[PDB]
């Protein structure tokens, strides 16, 4: 059965036939749902193979990737959020609106299984804000690029915009969730020195063996620094965005209402 799993995954990631790919991916999803232990290549290998496929032109194939994600184990997804989030950046960036919507669904999945890892991983906050503001069109950089010097030009769907504002509001409330301390562990201080670290990807804050990080790629694990950088750099732009979405009304207005609630709780 392991050989069948490997060949079906290889055909799903390499074949030219949308129907054969969706059937192979449904087969993999069915085996993973029936038994999570039935994974010869591991969750990391499955993610590494299926993550380039999130930009596929086939919406149904993207739906079976979503189902495969939702049947993957979240505790195994959690240590490897950064690669998934980078592929999510690619999905946000790709020009197809259906690909953007399915990648928004994938981002909602990844937030559901691991919010803290996404908002604390390197580049997980400000580059996500770059992506959201770019494909909502509230980007100050894009506005400055569109604006000219001296000249004064004249001033310038619904379901997609509502989904985008909903995912942005969910990401913002996830990054600004209130946090409570754990109770006292009697043997934590000495085990921290005399035992191996149980934290996934330890020494990430050192970044000794990695590329130097700018403001965009720096980690913001805690809510206080997240709120500091957010109020320093992104408050006014998405504030104007939510006011504009409120003036639009409709389902976009409802998504603006949840966004307003989240940003008001952030201001609290």
């Amino acid at each position: 059965s392991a050989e069948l799993f490997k060949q079906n995954l290889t055909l799903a990631v390499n074949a030219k036939s949308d129907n054969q790919r969706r059937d192979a991916l449904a087969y993999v999803t069915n085996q993973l749902s029936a038994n999570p232990a039935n994974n010869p290549v591991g969750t990391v290998g499955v993610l590494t193979k299926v993550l380039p496929l999130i930009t596929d032109g086939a919406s149904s194939v993207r739906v079976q990737l979503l189902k495969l994600f939702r049947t993957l184990p979240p505790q195994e997804v959690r240590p490897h959020a950064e690669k998934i989030l980078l592929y999510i950046r690619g999905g946000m960036t790709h020009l197809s609106n259906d690909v953007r919507t399915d990648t928004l669904n994938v981002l909602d999945w990844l937030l559901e299984v691991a919010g803290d890892e996404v908002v604390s991983c390197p580049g997980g906050w400000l580059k996500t804000l770059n992506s959201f503001s770019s494909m909502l069109g509230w980007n100050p950089n894009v506005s400055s690029a569109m604006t000219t010097k001296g000249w004064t030009s004249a001033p310038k769907g619904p379901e997609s915009q509502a989904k985008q504002i909903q995912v942005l509001a969910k990401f913002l409330q996830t990054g600004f969730r209130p946090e409570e301390p754990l109770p006292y562990k009697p043997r934590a201080y000495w085990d921290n020195i005399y035992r191996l670290p149980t934290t996934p990807n330890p020494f990430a804050y050192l970044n000794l063996f990695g590329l130097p990080r700018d403001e965009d790629s720096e980690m913001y694990p805690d809510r206080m620094s997240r709120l500091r950088v957010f109020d320093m750099k992104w408050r006014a732009a998405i504030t104007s965005g939510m006011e504009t979405a409120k003036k639009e009304g409709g389902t976009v207005g409802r998504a603006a209402a949840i966004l307003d609630k989240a940003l008001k709780a952030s201001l609290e």
Binding site: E179, P181, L182, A188, Y189, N192, I193, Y194, P197, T199, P202, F203, Y205, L206, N207, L208, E218, P221, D222, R223, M224, S225
Partner: protein
Amino acid sequence: STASPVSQAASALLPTFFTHLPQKHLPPDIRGLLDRTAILSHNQSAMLASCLHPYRDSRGRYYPSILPFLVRRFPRDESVEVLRSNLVK
């Protein structure tokens, strides 16, 4: 490069930022910068101080210890020989 007097004064101050400074009010980026400075400067006193004065997050979980770096840079120094005291019998 040679060691400037300002560098020597800062190196003598680096362990004190761990030993005699409240780490619960310290931002995580400054703690990371201090740990990077200690590791890349090979300050065994600062690495021992960082191991013995761990950083609590907002969650309450301690950060991983520098100790794998200290034991590989100074394997037979008194700083690690005192940490190996649980096997003395």
